[PDB]
Amino acid sequence: AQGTDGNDVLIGSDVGEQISGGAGDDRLDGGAGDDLLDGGAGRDRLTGGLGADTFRFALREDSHRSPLGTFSDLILDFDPSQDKIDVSALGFIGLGNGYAGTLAVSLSADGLRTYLKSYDADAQGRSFELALDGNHAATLSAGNIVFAAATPG
Ligand SMILES: [Ca+2]
Ligand SMILES: [Ca+2]
Ligand SMILES: [Ca+2]
Ligand SMILES: [Ca+2]
Ligand SMILES: [Ca+2]
Ligand SMILES: [Ca+2]
């Protein structure tokens, strides 16, 4: 149960579960039930399935990009009416610009993919960025992110 260091392919059952991938490149699948999914070090692909699911960092380096390669995580499909994403351990100095440690959101030309970018360079020049593939951008809501409370204006 759960993953270990190295690459893993993990598939969850119908009941609610807590699943961590550990280090390495992992795929996590949650299935039905409300699930907790920890990506761990390395780039990961997280699939929540039915139920309210929370996707979390386990390390401060859990999702970053560099010229040495991308180590960011991707969440698949995503239910914006129910699911939660926590990014607090990476840290961001702002939520509305997209450069120098401030977040912004971007979309693919067909809206089928969504990206969270920051171009962080606080000291190490390592940008902390995430992506969502297959995302229901058509029904996305600000409630999904840890900061929440983003009223329109
Ligand atoms: Ca692993
Ligand atoms: Ca499950
Ligand atoms: Ca991992
Ligand atoms: Ca689930
Ligand atoms: Ca879900
Ligand atoms: Ca990760």
Curated annotation (Swiss-Prot):
Residues 21-40 are annotated as: Disordered. It is found in: Secreted. Transmembrane segments: none annotated. Hemolysin-type calcium-binding repeats lie at residues 3-14, 21-37, 39-55. It comes from the Bacteria. Each enzyme of this family of C5 epimerases introduces its own characteristic sequence distribution of G-blocks in their substrates, explaining the extensive sequence variability of alginates. These alginates of varying composition have different physical properties and are necessary at different stages of the bacterium life cycle. Converts beta-D-mannuronic acid (M) to alpha-L-guluronic acid (G), producing a polymer with gel-forming capacity, required for the formation of the cyst coat. Belongs to the D-mannuronate C5-epimerase family. Composed of one catalytically active A module and three R modules. This is Mannuronan C5-epimerase AlgE6. It comes from Azotobacter vinelandii. The gene is algE6.
